[PDB]
Each structure stands twice: as structure tokens, then as C-alpha cells.
UniProtKB/Swiss-Prot annotation:
Native species: Homo sapiens
Lineage, opening ranks: Eukaryota, Metazoa, Chordata, Craniata, Vertebrata
Phenotypic consequence of residue 16 to A: Strongly reduces enzyme activity and stimulation of interferon production
Site (Important for preferential detection of curved long DNA): 27, 35
Annotated protein name in UniProt: Cyclic GMP-AMP synthase
Listed result of changing residue 266 to A: Decreased cyclic GMP-AMP synthase activity
């Protein structure tokens, strides 16, 4: 049935909702950094993505790991697609006052991410010590750009994002195919919202970031406008996504000593999930009574994605998250066997 799945969801819920001093420490540090950053010539317009977002948790199993985004608005941005990759871009400028705030990171016409991250980090690294023990790490880098450690238990990833309030880039034109589930008029409202760019390479390239659209969908996710508001209309969409996320996290934990699962992340799980939401648009296909079957649909579909090596980005249709140049055949084959073993054994990572 669903009894074991429900107990896992309850355990995860109680440790999320449990009273904790962690959010208070995170806010104190974040507000510290933002007052310092706003005084610099380059970052005077920096601010938190969401107010009330001192507590975004990418890892559903680790309530002490926090994800925060700092945004900077770039008016009249010029995007140049990098190397037909559809999702990666150079950032240039229209330069109305050619001494725009980010002029100091220009290299020719192209905005240097690594230079901008350099000053961002250095400014945070000096402000860190001038209350609590805050330590940072220069490891990996990219996005998350800056990782802080509050006390011993609590970690905070800080990602710097550029914000543009112009129309989404053309690679997204045929994406976000929610018309038969959330409706065409909601797709239009969503695509009027700004988009974000975060640093990453496949050089000085940036990629589109849609976490804010994901959050909007998840908070208003039914075909019915009253889905999950009360009574006879309680669905299991959010629970299926939580269980998918926890499955991958537990598997990456179990096999961290091997390297094969290193490239997989919640992006792959979230993307496959929203594809199943498109496949199954009716709220009656997500009945709370059917949690077991619905989670199994999600698992089946994800496994189908691994075997065919095809997982189309939910926002950029021509971008295959599972292309062999991104994740090789042997790694997808390894995750396939591990998930099939979980499924055929009433999921032992949920013990
Ligand atoms: O698809 C997304 N963003 C674009 C993108 C492009 C290439 C990538 N390559 C590797 C890793 C992550 C990648 C993300 C997205 C989807 C959801 Br649901 C929530 C937030 C998102 O940002
Ligand atoms: Zn619902």
C-alpha cells in the first residue's frame, strides 16, 4: 500500500516543522552580508530573491543545509547564446551609461562571471568576521558560489543571480507545456514574470534559473483551482515530488564512496516529476488514496528517462539533461539498477 510511504513523509515533515534556532542564525548572517554588499559600487542593487526566503532547503533530508539566492537587476541586458547549447549564454550590455554598475567586470563586451564572483566572495569574506562563528569555503564554486558554515551543524549556500524583466529568451518559447494542466492563461501569466541567470560552464557563461516558477507552480498545482484547499480534493503531487527527491538523496548518500551518482541532482528529479504532471493533468490522477501508485508512476517514468538517456528540460525543450555528453551511459545504467533494486524491495532506503 502506502503506509510505509506515509510514515516516511511524516518523519520528514516533523523534522522540517520542528522548532529550530537554525533559521535565526541564517537570517542574522544574510542581513549582515546584504547591508555590506549594498555599499559596494557593484552590488548596491543586490537583494534577496524572496522576502521570507532565509530558509530554502534543496536537500529534503538535511534540515541544516540552506539555499539562499541574492539577485541583481540587469536592465537592458544583451544575451548571446553560447555554442548552440540553448541554455547557456554570454551576457553583454546595451550600455546607456556605459559605466553601468557592472562595467567594472566587463571584458570587452562580455560580462565576466568569475571576476564578478571574485569581488562578491571577497566582499563577503571580509565582512564575515566583523557574534557567531561563520566560516566559508572556496571549494568547487560556480553555483552555489559561496558556502558558509554557521556553528558546526548549519550550512548556507549563497548564489548570485542576475534578474531580467524582459521576455524570456527564445529557447524557452515552446517550453513550460502546462496548457492542458494549469491552462494557457496561467502559462502566459508565468511567462510575464522575470527570468534569472546564474553562473555555470559546460568559460564566462550563465544559465537560466527558474526556481521561482517552480515554487509558484507547486503552491498552485492543481487542474482544479481548489486543489488541496480542503476536504474531497486532497492530492498527492507534492508528496510524490518529496519522495522522489528523498530517493535520489538517499541513493547519492549510500553510494558517495563510488562516483557514479555525482552528476545527478534534484533538477533531474524535479524535471521528470513535472513531466509526469503534464502526462497526468487531472487531479483525480493524484488522489491521496493512490499515493503508492502515483509514486510508482513517477519512478517508472524516471527509469524510462534513464534507459533512453532522454530527459528534456521542462523550460527549454531542446536541452536534454540526460545527454551522454552531460552524464555518460555507465552512470545512468548504475542509477537504473539501484532504483529498480529499491522498487523491487519495497524501498529499503526509506527505513
Ligand atoms: O530547468 C531549469 N533551469 C534551466 C537549467 C538548464 C540546464 C541545466 N543543466 C544542469 C543542471 C540544471 C540545469 C537547469 C529549472 C527547472 C526547475 Br523544475 C526548477 C529550476 C530550474 O532552474
Ligand atoms: Zn493538490
Amino acid at each position: 500500500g502506502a503506509s510505509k510511504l506515509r510514515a516516511v513523509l511524516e518523519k520528514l515533515k516533523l523534522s522540517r516543522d520542528d522548532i529550530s534556532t537554525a533559521a535565526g542564525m541564517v537570517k542574522g548572517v544574510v542581513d549582515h552580508l546584504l547591508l555590506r554588499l549594498k555599499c559596494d559600487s557593484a552590488f548596491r542593487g543586490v537583494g534577496l530573491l524572496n522576502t521570507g526566503s532565509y530558509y530554502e532547503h534543496v536537500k529534503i533530508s538535511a534540515p541544516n543545509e540552506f539555499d539562499v539566492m541574492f539577485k541583481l537587476e540587469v536592465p537592458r541586458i544583451q544575451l548571446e547564446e553560447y555554442s548552440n547549447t540553448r541554455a547557456y549564454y554570454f551576457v553583454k550590455f546595451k550600455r546607456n551609461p556605459k559605466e553601468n554598475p557592472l562595467s567594472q567586470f566587463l571584458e570587452g563586451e562580455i560580462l565576466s562571471a568569475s571576476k564578478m564572483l571574485s569581488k562578491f566572495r571577497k566582499i563577503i569574506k571580509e565582512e564575515i568576521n566583523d557574534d557567531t562563528d561563520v566560516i566559508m569555503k572556496r571549494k568547487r564554486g560556480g553555483s552555489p558560489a559561496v558556502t558558509l558554515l554557521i556553528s558546526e551543524k548549519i550550512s548556507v549556500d549563497i548564489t548570485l543571480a542576475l534578474e531580467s524583466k524582459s521576455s524570456w529568451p527564445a529557447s524557452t518559447q515552446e517550453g513550460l507545456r502546462i496548457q492542458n494542466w494549469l491552462s494557457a492563461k496561467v502559462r502566459k501569466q508565468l511567462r510575464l514574470k522575470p527570468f534569472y541567470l546564474v553562473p555555470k560552464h559546460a568559460e564566462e557563461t550563465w544559465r537560466l534559473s527558474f526556481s521561482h516558477i517552480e515554487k509558484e507552480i507547486l503552491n498552485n498545482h492543481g487542474k482544479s483551482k481548489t486543489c488541496c484547499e480542503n476536504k474531497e480534493e486532497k492530492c498527492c503531487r507534492k508528496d510524490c515530488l518529496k519522495l522522489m527527491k528523498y530517493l535520489l538523496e538517499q541513493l547519492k548518500e549510500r553510494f558517495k564512496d563510488k562516483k557514479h551518482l555525482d552528476k545527478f541532482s534534484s533538477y533531474h528529479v524535479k524535471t521528470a516529476f513535472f513531466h509526469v504532471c503534464t502526462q497526468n493533468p487531472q487531479d483525480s490522477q493524484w488522489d491521496r488514496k493512490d499515493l503508492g501508485l502515483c509514486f510508482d508512476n513517477c519512478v517508472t517514468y524516471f527509469l524510462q528517462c534513464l534507459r533512453t538517456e532522454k530527459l528534456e528540460n521542462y523550460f527549454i525543450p531542446e536541452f536534454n539533461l540526460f545527454s551522454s555528453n552531460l552524464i555518460d551511459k555507465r552512470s545512468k545504467e548504475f542509477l537504473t539498477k539501484q532504483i529498480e533494486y529499491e522498487r523491487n524491495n519495497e524501498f529499503p532506503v526509506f527505513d
